[PDB]
């Protein structure tokens, strides 16, 4: 269908980012697991973060994380880095393109 | 693994723009391909689409991208023939490539293919 | 009025194991090997007289449930000659029809039998039974291994048969291959007096081998 | 509908064909070429069209790539074991191919769904409705799930996006008793065209005979199909086509 994410967020390092991926009409998975999780850093390609918002793995940092309930998913990143913060993004599954998340990116002070 | 694209282009709108997708460290037929824009300013949009083992080639269907999609799997090279350009075309797409079947997804990533459409 | 309209073959009949079919309507056959069970007393029904002569239509009914199914098919005045027989598991089937008028009994007539069917259906029968139409007889032989003479005519219609075994004179024409046999002794058989039961004798007492 | 029929059962189920009473081309069967894999284990894959068999079963379904692989007598995992057989003594062809565009959908279609533990393995060309609850855990499960308590199946997604092992691949697989009963199941049996007045060999409806083939008038009757003379010579023939 169509999603929204959490737009932004700022803050520190050492954190817990939040991140809710917003899915209007279809609600996650009829097999109870959909959405994903994906990154696309400023000035660099697009990147694989988590599908189903539950999953992958290797090659996906431990600190992303996360799950999603119905329409809402949820990529919460554990202990931030001013570093290895850049926008983020979440495709649909079982309905319509897939498209992709509006974007996410959380800030980092200091 | 790695998604290798055709350069930038500049047309006109109403068009024909071809790309290539070159595949570099994976086999370019077990993935089913596509091409996904990045638009300026904008939400990623899966657009352009190709299957494994079959062809798919399915777009939002909405006002179709229509950009015409074929593969040589010798060649492992995507194509992305922008049918019915306009200016909004402009953007970065990306060829992507999904993973085994599951919930997803879209492993690897093209570099870009800075498209600029306009006068 | 055609009240005889079934055959229902078997070794059990009990609805296990295969048991063939035939059935009749409207000149539209039926057929099968599956394998079903009946009523006490397999029948056809019918009601009298009306718009629907015989009514009842709506008999229906032998039979329990058609169940794991090896085959299929669809599409006095009268004497009907149906032999029916096995060999290499192929169910076999010869016919008539032909018009007589009498009752009581097998018009002395000769007719030979063309088939119908070869059915390879693998059924193994050592028993069957029979249909009519409940609210005109029939009859059964069997077939043994005999011997005829048969003759053909120049249409290779079965005109007449001859026995062998039925009779001394009919051994005769066995040998000479001829129905015309003129005067004379024409040596056929020969005849080897049976025995009787058997005489086993062996030295008594018998003791006992030690092979053990 | 072996191959054509659109929707084909899961492959926890399937379907039991019987194929009898009929002359089976396996030429376009062999020929299509849209076949992933024409795979023959116990037989010959273009002397079919030659050979005949009483029986003949077909069984369709639906499996991973992966999996089309794993079907071989002497192929076991968690297909042979618990959702579907194989015969041990497993002789004939298995002809797969992928569905996915067709049976597959952007949701992961989970109408096609394997079976995850029920702890026996099924005999050759069978199946099990069984619903229960596997049991892991020696505890008892109630029939429900809980602690190492498992629904016996398990739902294939079916992406058209999946990679390959993950799209359906539609294999229906033969069977057959060869000859030894009422033979049934034949391939097609190719008539020439027909000389006269010269020479030939020839062969009708399995009658093998060497002549001069001609035009006669003598009429049969029309369930007869050879002459014959005095000598038991086969002389008339009746054309067959
Ligand atoms: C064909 O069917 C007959 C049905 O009777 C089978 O005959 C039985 O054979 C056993 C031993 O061979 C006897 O003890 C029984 O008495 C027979 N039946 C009856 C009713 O007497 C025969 O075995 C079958 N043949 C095959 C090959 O299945
Ligand atoms: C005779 O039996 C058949 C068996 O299929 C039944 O379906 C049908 O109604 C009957 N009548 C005719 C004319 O076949
Ligand atoms: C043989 O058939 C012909 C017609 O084909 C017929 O005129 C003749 O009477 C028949 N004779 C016999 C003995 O069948
Ligand atoms: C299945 O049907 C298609 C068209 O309906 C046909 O081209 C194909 O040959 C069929 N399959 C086989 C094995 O013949």
Redesign the pocket.
């Known amino acids: 269908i169509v999603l929204t994410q959490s737009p932004t967020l700022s803050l520190s390092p050492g954190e817990r980012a939040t991140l809710s991926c917003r899915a209007s009409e279809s609600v996650d998975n009829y097999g109870i697991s959909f959405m994903n999780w994906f990154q696309q850093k400023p000035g660099q390609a697009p990147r694989l973060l988590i599908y189903a918002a539950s999953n992958q793995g290797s090659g996906i940092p431990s600190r992303f994380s996360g799950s999603g309930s119905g329409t809402d998913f949820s990529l919460t990143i554990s202990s931030l880095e001013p570093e290895d913060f850049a926008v983020y993004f979440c495709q649909q599954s079982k309905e319509v393109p897939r498209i992709f998340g509006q974007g996410t990116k959380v800030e980092i002070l200091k | 693994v790695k998604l290798v694209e055709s350069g930038g282009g500049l047309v006109k709108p109403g068009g024909s723009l071809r790309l290539s997708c070159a595949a570099s460290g994976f086999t370019f037929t077990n993935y089913g391909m596509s091409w996904v824009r990045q638009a300026p300013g904008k939400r990623l949009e899966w657009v352009a689409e190709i299957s494994s083992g079959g062809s798919y080639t399915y777009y939002p269907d909405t006002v179709t991208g229509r950009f015409t999609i074929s593969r040589d799997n010798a060649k492992n090279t995507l194509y992305l023939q922008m049918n019915s350009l306009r200016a909004e075309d402009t953007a970065v797409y990306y060829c992507a490539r999904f993973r085994y079947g599951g919930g997803g997804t879209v492993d690897y990533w093209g570099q870009g293919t800075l498209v600029t459409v306009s006068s | 009025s055609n009240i005889i309209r079934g055959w229902i073959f078997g070794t059990t009949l009990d609805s296990k194991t295969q048991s063939l079919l035939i059935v009749n309507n409207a000149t539209n056959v039926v057929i099968k090997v599956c394998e079903f069970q009946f009523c006490n007393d397999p029948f056809l029904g019918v009601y009298y007289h009306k718009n629907n002569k015989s009514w009842m239509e709506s008999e229906f009914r032998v039979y329990s449930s058609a169940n794991n199914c090896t085959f299929e098919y669809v599409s006095f005045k009268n004497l009907r000659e149906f032999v029916f027989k096995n060999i290499d598991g192929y169910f076999k089937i010869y016919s008539k029809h032909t018009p007589i008028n009498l009752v009581r009994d097998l018009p002395q007539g000769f007719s030979a039998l063309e088939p119908l069917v070869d059915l390879p259906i693998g059924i193994n029968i050592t028993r069957f039974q029979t249909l009519l139409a409940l609210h005109a007889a029939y009859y059964v032989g069997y077939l043994q291994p005999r011997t005829f003479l048969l003759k053909y005519?120049?249409?290779g219609?079965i005109?007449d048969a001859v026995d062998c075994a039925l009779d001394p004179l009919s051994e005769t024409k066995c040998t000479l291959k001829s129905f015309t046999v003129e005067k004379g002794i024409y040596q056929t058989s020969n005849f080897r007096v049976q025995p009787t039961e058997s005489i086993v004798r062996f030295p008594n007492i018998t003791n006992l081998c030690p092979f053990g | 509908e072996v191959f054509n029929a659109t929707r084909f059962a899961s492959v926890y189920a399937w379907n039991r064909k019987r194929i009898s009473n009929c002359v089976a081309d396996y030429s376009v069967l062999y020929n299509s070429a849209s076949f992933s894999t024409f795979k023959c284990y116990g037989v010959s894959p273009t002397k079919l069209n030659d050979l005949c068999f009483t029986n003949v079963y077909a069984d369709s379904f639906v499996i991973r790539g992966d999996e089309v692989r794993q079907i071989a007598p002497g192929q076991t995992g968690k297909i042979a074991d618990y959702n579907y057989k194989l015969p041990d003594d497993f002789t004939g062809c298995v002809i797969a191919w992928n569905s996915n565009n067709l049976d597959s959908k952007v949701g992961g279609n989970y109408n096609y769904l394997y079976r995850l533990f029920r702890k026996s393995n099924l005999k050759p060309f069978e199946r099990d409705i069984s619903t229960e609850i596997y049991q892991a855990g020696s505890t008892p499960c109630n029939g429900v799930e809980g602690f190492n308590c498992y629904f016996p199946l398990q739902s294939y997604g079916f992406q058209p996006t999946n990679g390959v092992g993950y799209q359906p691949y539609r294999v229906v697989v033969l069977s057959f008793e060869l000859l030894h009963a009422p033979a049934t199941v034949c391939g097609p049996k190719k008539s020439t065209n027909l000389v006269k007045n010269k020479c030939v060999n020839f062969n009708f409806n399995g009658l093998t005979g060497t002549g001069v083939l001609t035009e006669s008038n003598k009429?049969f009757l029309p369930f007869q199909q050879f002459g014959r003379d005095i000598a038991d010579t086969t002389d008339a023939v009746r054309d067959p086509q």
């Open positions: 005519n120049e249409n219609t005109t | 009429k």
